[PDB]
Write an enzyme that holds these catalytic residues in place. Structure first.
Site, PDB file in Angstrom:
ATOM      1  N   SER A 153      -0.397  15.668 -11.911  1.00 57.28           N
ATOM      2  CA  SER A 153      -0.623  15.307 -13.291  1.00 57.28           C
ATOM      3  C   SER A 153      -0.831  16.565 -14.118  1.00 57.28           C
ATOM      4  O   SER A 153      -1.358  17.541 -13.630  1.00 57.28           O
ATOM      5  CB  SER A 153      -1.832  14.367 -13.405  1.00 57.28           C
ATOM      6  OG  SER A 153      -2.230  14.214 -14.749  1.00 57.28           O
ATOM      7  N   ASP A 186       0.825  -1.203   0.000  1.00 57.53           N
ATOM      8  CA  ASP A 186       0.000   0.000   0.000  1.00 57.53           C
ATOM      9  C   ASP A 186       0.860   1.255   0.000  1.00 57.53           C
ATOM     10  O   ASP A 186       1.360   1.675   1.053  1.00 57.53           O
ATOM     11  CB  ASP A 186      -0.942  -0.016   1.225  1.00 57.53           C
ATOM     12  CG  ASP A 186      -1.841   1.200   1.296  1.00 57.53           C
ATOM     13  OD1 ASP A 186      -1.920   1.930   0.293  1.00 57.53           O
ATOM     14  OD2 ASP A 186      -2.460   1.410   2.371  1.00 57.53           O
TER      15      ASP A 186
END
Length: 330
Positions: free
Chosen positions: A199, A35
């Site tokens: 992004s 994770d």
């Protein structure tokens, strides 16, 4: 040193991925959920409330000659999906894919929430976010990666998740055969303890690319792609009959639909998520209403590049003094 382990979806939807991990002496092999959005290595154990164990493999510290109770230490964690767990702590030897850490904090669950109990395929979590998020008290503990970093050939691990198929986690090296073209590296903020990046934008199917900054975390421990409501609306508008359902808890779409791809930007480069990756199947057995793999992050507080996004790429988690993230197509 290096390590290399295969990671396998737990079910036909790729709801999560498990990776075998050797704990203790002799080895006890548990299948953990790697994770990159948390920083605790915790396991079902001999200490877990009996009623809360249902099919998981447990770590038994008393059977490990290298296990030592970390005196006074406790841990307690809650994840973004409302699930939780807590217990005490041992140090023991932990190996992943041939890479060994001695003195790793192994957090032994005394309590787990129902969602963990109900998932027989996941024996625990192995956190790979920054150690600043580790919940052990009163002495915070380091992640497996953090402990191994100095011994690694290169201070990196990589995530190569498969679509409906196994993939790989590598530690200490970049497999140049595992991706196409070049790896584009992008800046990371560690200020929230996550692999947090920005992004450069997105496209829906064959549509034009929208240049826009989207701050989010690269999170192998989240199934879906969670993005701003504007982005998510623009995606699902391209699917006839798609709608956001409050009763279901997100965007649903007719199972008869063909989903368009979703592209996200990494600097000047582009990662394409095929439409198939965004299908998470009927909302309930036999339903013709299917659950979408792109969902709104509104109300989460952060955007999450979960498995839906990450499995479309080869992803480098670079833990150099100044961490960065790398993405390549594959």
């Amino acid at each position: 040193s290096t390590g290399s382990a295969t990671t396998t979806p737990i079910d036909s939807l790729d709801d999560a991925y498990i990776t075998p991990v050797q704990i203790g002496t002799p080895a006890q092999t548990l299948n953990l959920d790697f994770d990159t959005g948390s920083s605790d290595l915790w396991v079902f154990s001999s200490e877990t409330t009996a009623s809360e164990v249902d099919g998981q493999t447990i770590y038994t510290p008393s059977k490990s000659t290298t296990a030592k109770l970390l005196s006074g230490a406790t841990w307690s964690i809650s994840y973004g999906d409302g699930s939780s767990s807590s217990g005490d702590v041992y140090t023991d030897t932990v190996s992943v894919g041939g890479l060994t850490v001695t003195g790793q904090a192994v957090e032994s669950a005394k309590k787990v929430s129902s969602s963990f109990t109900e998932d027989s395929t996941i024996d625990g979590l192995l956190g790979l976010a920054f150690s600043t998020l580790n919940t052990v008290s009163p002495t915070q503990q380091k992640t497996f990666f953090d402990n191994a970093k100095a011994s690694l050939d290169s201070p990196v691990f990589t995530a190569d998740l498969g679509y409906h198929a196994p993939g790989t986690y590598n530690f200490g090296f970049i497999d140049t055969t595992a991706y196409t073209g070049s790896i584009t590296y992008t800046a990371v903020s560690t200020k929230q303890g996550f692999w947090e990046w920005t992004s450069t934008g997105y496209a829906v199917g064959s549509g034009t690319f929208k240049s826009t900054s989207i701050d989010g975390i690269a999170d192998t421990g989240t199934t879906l792609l969670y993005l701003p409501a504007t982005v998510v609306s623009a995606y699902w508008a391209q699917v006839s009959g798609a709608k956001s359902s409050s009763s279901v808890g997100g965007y649903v779409f007719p199972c008869s639909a063909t989903l368009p791809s979703f592209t996200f930007g990494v600097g000047s480069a582009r990662i394409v998520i095929p439409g198939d990756y965004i299908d998470f199947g009927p909302i309930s057995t036999g339903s013709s209403s299917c659950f979408g793999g792109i969902q709104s992050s509104a109300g989460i507080g952060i955007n999450i590049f979960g498995d839906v996004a990450l499995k479309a790429a080869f992803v480098v988690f670079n833990g150099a003094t100044t961490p960065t993230l790398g993405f390549a197509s594959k």
